[PDB]
């Protein structure tokens, strides 16, 4: 059960991240290809190392998703100096095996993708030179998690800095909320007052 | 407190340009 919900979320978050990367021009347009998921046009990256990086990131998270130990998955955008400008927070909440209800929930997720696709319509451009990162917030205190989250040796995870997180102001900009009996997730952006 | 991140950073923009036309 709770296992397949993870596969879904993992499948989702993977696309979201690729789209976010395009839409915020974190990488150039020429490495992306248009595909379709969630019966929608997306941009996925054809750079294998980048793809591998993301797959890896999300293989690791999968197992915590199953136990509903994850509270947030945040994509973070960092500038040249190395300070977080934007953040795509995906806040998760989870409450006996379905079928159509599963595809319903899955299709819905397209509402989100479509927000990300046009979000630029509401954010202010980033400065040239940005990179990203993914942070996972646990409901409980990162550490039982710590042994479990190293699913892929060679892809290790550490504990976050105050550096990595920190960012006053910022500005909150909602994007989508959804509620099912089995999954609730809200995606919004926090966005440094001065990107410069 | 509750916050994990991959040790590794993703491919830089430059690294990626080398492979494109």
């Amino acid at each position: 059960f709770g296992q397949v919900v993870a596969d879904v979320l993992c499948e989702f978050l993977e696309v979201a991240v690729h789209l976010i990367l395009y839409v915020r021009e974190v990488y150039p347009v020429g490495i992306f290809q248009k595909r379709k998921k969630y019966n929608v046009p997306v941009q996925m990256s054809c750079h294998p190392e980048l793809n591998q990086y993301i797959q890896d990131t999300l293989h690791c998270v999968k197992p915590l998703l199953e136990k509903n130990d994850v509270e947030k998955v945040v994509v973070v955008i960092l500038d040249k100096e190395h300070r977080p400008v934007e953040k795509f927070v995906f806040e998760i909440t989870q409450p006996i095996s379905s079928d159509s209800l599963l595809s319903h929930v899955e299709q819905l997720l397209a509402a989100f993708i479509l927000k990300i696709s046009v979000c630029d319509a509401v954010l202010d451009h980033n400065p040239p030179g940005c990179t990203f990162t993914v942070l996972v917030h646990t409901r409980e205190a990162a550490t039982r998690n710590m042994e479990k989250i190293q699913v892929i040796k060679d892809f290790p995870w550490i504990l976050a800095d105050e550096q990595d997180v920190h960012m006053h102001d910022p500005r909150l900009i909602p994007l989508k909320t959804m509620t099912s009996d089995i999954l609730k997730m809200q995606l919004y952006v926090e966005e440094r007052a001065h990107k410069g | 407190a509750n916050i994990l991140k991959p040790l590794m950073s993703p491919p830089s923009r430059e690294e990626i340009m080398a492979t494109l036309l």
Side-chain angles (χ1 to χ4, degrees), chain A residues 74-134:
Chain A
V74 182
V75 159
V76 189
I77 315 285
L78 303 153
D79 64 0
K80 271 167 199 160
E81 286 67 9
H82 289 144
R83 293 182 183 174
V85 177
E86 312 174 313
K87 287 188 182 147
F88 296 66
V89 171
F90 297 64
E91 214 154 15
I92 287 134
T93 309
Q94 316 182 239
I96 80 109
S97 209
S98 154
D99 186 356
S100 56
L101 167 58
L102 286 173
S103 82
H104 187 237
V105 171
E106 189 187 51
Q107 259 285 240
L108 288 189
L109 286 171
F112 282 81
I113 291 309
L114 289 170
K115 284 312 234 254
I116 285 136
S117 42
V118 298
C119 57
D120 61 298
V122 300
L123 321 160
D124 305 330
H125 295 139
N126 302 323
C130 290
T131 58
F132 78 103
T133 219
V134 169

Coordinates of all heavy atoms in Angstrom, one line a residue, chain A residues 74-134:
Chain A
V74 N 12.0 19.6 -0.4 CA 12.2 21.0 -0.9 C 13.3 21.0 -2.0 O 14.4 20.5 -1.8 CB 12.7 21.9 0.2 CG1 12.9 23.3 -0.3 CG2 11.7 21.9 1.3
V75 N 13.0 21.5 -3.1 CA 14.0 21.8 -4.1 C 14.5 23.2 -3.8 O 13.7 24.2 -3.7 CB 13.6 21.8 -5.5 CG1 14.6 22.6 -6.3 CG2 13.4 20.4 -6.1
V76 N 15.8 23.3 -3.7 CA 16.4 24.6 -3.4 C 17.3 25.1 -4.5 O 18.2 24.4 -5.0 CB 17.2 24.7 -2.0 CG1 17.6 26.1 -1.7 CG2 16.5 24.1 -0.9
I77 N 17.1 26.4 -4.8 CA 18.0 27.1 -5.8 C 18.9 28.0 -5.1 O 18.6 29.0 -4.4 CB 17.1 28.0 -6.6 CG1 15.9 27.3 -7.1 CG2 18.0 28.5 -7.8 CD1 16.1 26.3 -8.2
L78 N 20.2 27.9 -5.5 CA 21.3 28.6 -4.9 C 22.0 29.4 -5.9 O 22.3 28.9 -7.0 CB 22.3 27.6 -4.2 CG 21.6 26.7 -3.2 CD1 22.4 25.4 -3.0 CD2 21.5 27.5 -1.8
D79 N 22.4 30.6 -5.6 CA 23.1 31.5 -6.6 C 24.6 31.2 -6.7 O 25.1 30.1 -6.2 CB 23.0 33.0 -6.1 CG 23.6 33.2 -4.8 OD1 24.2 32.3 -4.2 OD2 23.6 34.4 -4.3
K80 N 25.4 32.1 -7.4 CA 26.8 32.0 -7.5 C 27.5 31.9 -6.1 O 28.3 31.0 -5.8 CB 27.4 33.1 -8.3 CG 27.5 33.1 -9.7 CD 27.8 34.4 -10.3 CE 27.4 34.4 -11.9 NZ 27.2 35.7 -12.5
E81 N 27.2 32.9 -5.2 CA 27.9 32.9 -3.9 C 27.6 31.7 -3.1 O 28.4 31.3 -2.3 CB 27.5 34.2 -3.1 CG 28.2 35.5 -3.7 CD 27.7 35.8 -5.1 OE1 26.7 35.2 -5.6 OE2 28.2 36.7 -5.7
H82 N 26.4 31.2 -3.3 CA 26.0 29.9 -2.6 C 24.9 30.2 -1.6 O 25.0 29.7 -0.5 CB 27.2 29.2 -2.0 CG 28.1 28.7 -3.0 ND1 29.5 28.6 -2.8 CD2 27.9 28.1 -4.2 CE1 30.0 28.1 -3.9 NE2 29.1 27.7 -4.7
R83 N 24.0 31.1 -1.9 CA 22.9 31.4 -0.9 C 21.6 31.2 -1.5 O 21.3 31.7 -2.6 CB 23.1 32.8 -0.4 CG 24.3 33.0 0.4 CD 24.4 34.4 0.9 NE 25.7 34.7 1.6 CZ 26.0 35.9 2.0 NH1 25.3 36.9 1.8 NH2 27.2 36.0 2.7
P84 N 20.7 30.4 -0.8 CA 19.4 30.0 -1.3 C 18.5 31.1 -1.8 O 18.1 32.0 -1.0 CB 18.7 29.2 -0.1 CG 19.8 29.2 0.9 CD 21.0 30.0 0.6
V85 N 18.0 31.1 -3.0 CA 17.2 32.2 -3.5 C 15.8 31.7 -3.4 O 15.0 32.2 -2.6 CB 17.5 32.6 -4.9 CG1 16.5 33.7 -5.4 CG2 18.9 33.2 -5.0
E86 N 15.4 30.7 -4.2 CA 14.1 30.2 -4.2 C 14.1 28.8 -3.5 O 15.1 28.2 -3.4 CB 13.5 30.0 -5.6 CG 13.8 31.2 -6.5 CD 13.3 30.9 -8.0 OE1 13.7 29.9 -8.5 OE2 12.6 31.8 -8.5
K87 N 12.9 28.3 -3.2 CA 12.7 27.0 -2.6 C 11.4 26.4 -3.1 O 10.4 27.1 -2.9 CB 12.6 27.0 -1.1 CG 13.9 27.2 -0.4 CD 13.7 27.0 1.1 CE 14.9 27.3 2.0 NZ 14.5 27.9 3.3
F88 N 11.4 25.2 -3.7 CA 10.1 24.7 -4.0 C 9.8 23.6 -3.0 O 10.4 22.5 -3.0 CB 10.1 24.1 -5.4 CG 10.2 25.2 -6.4 CD1 11.4 25.9 -6.5 CD2 9.2 25.6 -7.2 CE1 11.5 27.0 -7.4 CE2 9.3 26.6 -8.1 CZ 10.5 27.3 -8.2
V89 N 8.9 24.0 -2.0 CA 8.6 23.2 -0.9 C 7.5 22.2 -1.4 O 6.7 22.7 -2.1 CB 8.0 24.0 0.2 CG1 7.4 23.2 1.3 CG2 9.1 24.9 0.8
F90 N 7.5 21.0 -1.0 CA 6.3 20.2 -1.3 C 6.0 19.6 0.0 O 6.8 18.8 0.5 CB 6.6 19.0 -2.3 CG 7.1 19.4 -3.6 CD1 8.3 20.1 -3.8 CD2 6.3 19.0 -4.8 CE1 8.7 20.4 -5.1 CE2 6.7 19.4 -6.1 CZ 7.9 20.1 -6.2
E91 N 5.0 20.1 0.6 CA 4.7 19.6 2.0 C 3.8 18.4 1.8 O 2.9 18.4 1.0 CB 4.0 20.7 2.8 CG 4.4 20.6 4.2 CD 4.2 22.0 5.0 OE1 3.6 22.9 4.5 OE2 4.8 22.0 6.1
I92 N 4.1 17.3 2.5 CA 3.3 16.1 2.3 C 2.6 15.8 3.6 O 3.1 16.0 4.7 CB 4.2 14.9 2.0 CG1 4.6 15.1 0.5 CG2 3.5 13.6 2.3 CD1 6.1 14.8 0.3
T93 N 1.4 15.4 3.5 CA 0.7 14.6 4.6 C 0.1 13.3 4.0 O -0.4 13.2 2.8 CB -0.4 15.4 5.3 OG1 0.2 16.7 5.7 CG2 -1.0 14.7 6.5
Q94 N 0.1 12.2 4.8 CA -0.4 10.9 4.4 C -1.2 10.3 5.6 O -0.7 10.3 6.8 CB 0.6 9.8 4.0 CG 1.7 10.3 3.1 CD 2.7 9.2 2.8 OE1 3.9 9.2 3.0 NE2 2.2 8.1 2.1
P95 N -2.4 9.8 5.4 CA -3.2 9.2 6.5 C -3.0 7.7 6.8 O -3.5 7.2 7.7 CB -4.7 9.4 6.0 CG -4.5 10.2 4.7 CD -3.2 9.9 4.2
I96 N -7.1 0.7 1.8 CA -6.4 -0.6 2.0 C -6.1 -1.2 0.6 O -6.4 -2.4 0.4 CB -7.3 -1.5 2.9 CG1 -8.4 -2.2 2.2 CG2 -7.8 -0.7 4.1 CD1 -8.3 -3.7 2.0
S97 N -5.5 -0.5 -0.3 CA -5.3 -0.9 -1.7 C -6.5 -0.4 -2.6 O -7.6 -0.9 -2.4 CB -5.1 -2.4 -1.8 OG -4.3 -2.8 -2.9
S98 N -6.2 0.5 -3.5 CA -7.2 1.0 -4.5 C -6.9 0.7 -5.9 O -6.1 -0.2 -6.2 CB -7.3 2.5 -4.3 OG -7.8 3.1 -5.5
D99 N -7.6 1.4 -6.9 CA -7.3 1.2 -8.3 C -7.6 2.4 -9.2 O -6.6 3.0 -9.7 CB -8.2 0.0 -8.8 CG -7.8 -0.2 -10.2 OD1 -6.9 0.5 -10.8 OD2 -8.3 -1.1 -10.8
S100 N -8.8 2.8 -9.4 CA -9.2 4.0 -10.0 C -8.8 5.2 -9.1 O -8.2 6.2 -9.6 CB -10.7 4.1 -10.4 OG -11.5 3.9 -9.2
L101 N -9.1 5.1 -7.8 CA -8.7 6.1 -6.9 C -7.2 6.4 -7.0 O -6.8 7.5 -6.7 CB -9.0 5.7 -5.4 CG -8.4 6.5 -4.3 CD1 -8.8 8.0 -4.4 CD2 -8.8 5.9 -3.0
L102 N -6.4 5.4 -7.3 CA -4.9 5.6 -7.4 C -4.7 6.4 -8.7 O -3.9 7.4 -8.6 CB -4.2 4.3 -7.5 CG -4.1 3.6 -6.2 CD1 -3.5 2.2 -6.4 CD2 -3.4 4.3 -5.1
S103 N -5.3 6.1 -9.8 CA -5.0 6.8 -11.0 C -5.6 8.2 -10.9 O -5.0 9.2 -11.4 CB -5.6 6.1 -12.2 OG -6.9 6.3 -12.4
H104 N -6.8 8.4 -10.2 CA -7.3 9.7 -10.0 C -6.3 10.7 -9.3 O -6.1 11.7 -9.8 CB -8.5 9.6 -9.0 CG -9.3 10.9 -8.8 ND1 -9.5 11.4 -7.6 CD2 -9.9 11.7 -9.7 CE1 -10.2 12.5 -7.7 NE2 -10.5 12.7 -9.0
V105 N -5.8 10.2 -8.2 CA -4.8 11.0 -7.4 C -3.7 11.3 -8.3 O -3.2 12.5 -8.3 CB -4.4 10.1 -6.2 CG1 -3.2 10.8 -5.5 CG2 -5.5 9.9 -5.2
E106 N -3.2 10.3 -9.1 CA -2.1 10.4 -10.0 C -2.3 11.4 -11.1 O -1.5 12.3 -11.3 CB -1.8 9.1 -10.6 CG -0.4 9.0 -11.3 CD -0.3 7.6 -12.1 OE1 -1.2 7.2 -12.8 OE2 0.8 7.0 -11.9
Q107 N -3.5 11.3 -11.7 CA -3.8 12.3 -12.7 C -3.8 13.7 -12.2 O -3.1 14.6 -12.7 CB -5.1 12.0 -13.5 CG -4.9 11.4 -14.9 CD -4.4 12.3 -16.0 OE1 -5.0 12.5 -17.0 NE2 -3.2 12.9 -15.8
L108 N -4.6 13.9 -11.1 CA -4.7 15.2 -10.4 C -3.3 15.9 -10.4 O -3.2 17.0 -10.9 CB -5.2 15.1 -9.0 CG -6.6 14.8 -8.7 CD1 -7.0 15.0 -7.2 CD2 -7.6 15.6 -9.6
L109 N -2.3 15.1 -10.0 CA -1.0 15.7 -9.9 C -0.5 16.6 -11.0 O 0.4 17.5 -10.8 CB 0.1 14.6 -9.7 CG -0.1 14.0 -8.3 CD1 0.8 12.8 -8.1 CD2 0.3 15.1 -7.3
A110 N -1.1 16.5 -12.1 CA -0.9 17.3 -13.3 C -1.3 18.8 -13.0 O -0.8 19.7 -13.6 CB -1.7 16.8 -14.5
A111 N -2.2 19.0 -12.0 CA -2.5 20.4 -11.6 C -1.3 21.1 -11.2 O -1.0 22.2 -11.6 CB -3.6 20.4 -10.5
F112 N -0.5 20.3 -10.5 CA 0.8 20.9 -9.9 C 1.8 21.2 -11.0 O 2.4 22.3 -11.1 CB 1.4 19.8 -9.0 CG 0.8 19.7 -7.6 CD1 -0.4 19.0 -7.5 CD2 1.4 20.3 -6.5 CE1 -0.9 18.9 -6.2 CE2 0.8 20.2 -5.3 CZ -0.4 19.5 -5.1
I113 N 2.0 20.2 -11.9 CA 3.0 20.4 -13.0 C 2.7 21.6 -13.7 O 3.5 22.4 -13.9 CB 2.9 19.2 -14.0 CG1 3.3 17.9 -13.3 CG2 3.6 19.6 -15.3 CD1 4.7 18.0 -12.6
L114 N 1.4 21.7 -14.1 CA 0.9 22.9 -14.8 C 1.1 24.2 -13.9 O 1.3 25.3 -14.5 CB -0.6 22.8 -15.1 CG -0.9 21.8 -16.3 CD1 -2.4 21.5 -16.4 CD2 -0.4 22.3 -17.6
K115 N 1.1 24.1 -12.6 CA 1.5 25.4 -12.0 C 3.0 25.6 -12.2 O 3.4 26.6 -12.7 CB 1.1 25.4 -10.5 CG -0.3 25.7 -10.3 CD -0.9 26.8 -11.2 CE -1.7 28.0 -10.3 NZ -3.2 28.0 -10.4
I116 N 3.8 24.6 -11.9 CA 5.2 24.8 -12.1 C 5.5 25.4 -13.5 O 6.3 26.3 -13.6 CB 6.0 23.6 -11.8 CG1 6.0 23.3 -10.3 CG2 7.4 23.6 -12.5 CD1 5.7 21.9 -9.9
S117 N 4.9 24.9 -14.5 CA 5.2 25.2 -15.8 C 5.1 26.8 -16.1 O 6.0 27.3 -16.8 CB 4.3 24.5 -16.8 OG 3.0 24.5 -16.3
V118 N 4.1 27.4 -15.5 CA 4.0 28.8 -15.8 C 4.3 29.7 -14.6 O 4.1 30.9 -14.6 CB 2.5 29.1 -16.3 CG1 2.2 28.4 -17.6 CG2 1.5 28.8 -15.2
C119 N 5.0 29.2 -13.6 CA 5.3 29.9 -12.3 C 6.1 31.2 -12.6 O 5.7 32.2 -12.0 CB 6.0 29.1 -11.3 SG 7.6 28.3 -11.7
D120 N 7.1 31.1 -13.4 CA 7.8 32.3 -13.9 C 6.9 33.5 -13.9 O 7.3 34.6 -13.7 CB 8.4 32.0 -15.2 CG 7.3 31.7 -16.3 OD1 6.5 30.7 -16.1 OD2 7.1 32.5 -17.2
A121 N 5.6 33.2 -14.3 CA 4.6 34.3 -14.3 C 4.4 34.9 -12.9 O 3.7 35.8 -12.8 CB 3.3 33.7 -14.8
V122 N 5.1 34.4 -11.9 CA 4.8 35.0 -10.5 C 6.1 35.1 -9.7 O 6.1 35.8 -8.7 CB 3.9 34.1 -9.7 CG1 2.5 34.0 -10.4 CG2 4.4 32.7 -9.5
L123 N 7.2 34.5 -10.2 CA 8.5 34.7 -9.6 C 9.3 35.7 -10.3 O 9.0 36.0 -11.5 CB 9.3 33.4 -9.5 CG 8.6 32.1 -9.2 CD1 9.5 30.9 -9.7 CD2 8.3 32.0 -7.7
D124 N 10.3 36.3 -9.7 CA 11.2 37.2 -10.3 C 12.5 36.5 -10.6 O 13.0 35.7 -9.8 CB 11.5 38.4 -9.3 CG 10.2 39.1 -8.9 OD1 9.2 39.1 -9.6 OD2 10.2 39.6 -7.7
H125 N 13.0 36.7 -11.8 CA 14.1 35.9 -12.4 C 15.2 35.8 -11.4 O 15.5 36.6 -10.5 CB 14.7 36.6 -13.7 CG 13.7 36.6 -14.8 ND1 13.6 37.7 -15.7 CD2 12.8 35.7 -15.3 CE1 12.7 37.5 -16.6 NE2 12.2 36.3 -16.4
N126 N 15.9 34.6 -11.5 CA 17.1 34.4 -10.7 C 18.3 35.1 -11.3 O 18.3 35.4 -12.5 CB 17.3 32.9 -10.6 CG 16.1 32.2 -9.9 OD1 15.5 32.8 -9.1 ND2 15.8 31.0 -10.4
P127 N 19.4 35.3 -10.5 CA 20.6 35.9 -11.1 C 21.3 34.7 -11.9 O 21.1 33.6 -11.5 CB 21.4 36.2 -9.9 CG 20.5 36.2 -8.7 CD 19.5 35.2 -9.1
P128 N 22.0 35.1 -12.9 CA 22.8 34.0 -13.6 C 23.7 33.2 -12.6 O 24.1 33.8 -11.5 CB 23.7 34.8 -14.5 CG 23.5 36.3 -14.2 CD 22.2 36.4 -13.5
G129 N 23.9 32.0 -12.9 CA 24.9 31.2 -12.2 C 24.4 30.2 -11.2 O 25.1 29.7 -10.4
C130 N 23.0 29.9 -11.2 CA 22.4 29.2 -10.1 C 22.6 27.7 -10.2 O 22.8 27.1 -11.3 CB 20.9 29.5 -10.0 SG 20.6 31.1 -9.4
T131 N 22.5 27.0 -9.1 CA 22.5 25.6 -9.0 C 21.4 25.2 -8.0 O 20.7 26.0 -7.5 CB 23.9 25.1 -8.4 OG1 24.1 25.8 -7.1 CG2 25.1 25.5 -9.3
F132 N 21.2 23.9 -7.8 CA 20.2 23.4 -6.9 C 20.6 22.3 -6.1 O 21.7 21.7 -6.3 CB 18.9 23.0 -7.7 CG 19.1 21.7 -8.3 CD1 18.5 20.6 -7.7 CD2 19.9 21.5 -9.4 CE1 18.6 19.3 -8.2 CE2 20.0 20.2 -10.0 CZ 19.4 19.1 -9.4
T133 N 19.7 21.8 -5.3 CA 20.0 20.9 -4.2 C 18.6 20.5 -3.8 O 17.6 21.1 -4.2 CB 20.6 21.8 -3.1 OG1 21.6 21.0 -2.5 CG2 19.5 22.2 -2.1
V134 N 18.5 19.4 -3.0 CA 17.2 18.9 -2.5 C 17.4 18.6 -1.1 O 18.4 18.0 -0.7 CB 16.9 17.6 -3.2 CG1 15.7 16.9 -2.6 CG2 16.7 17.8 -4.8

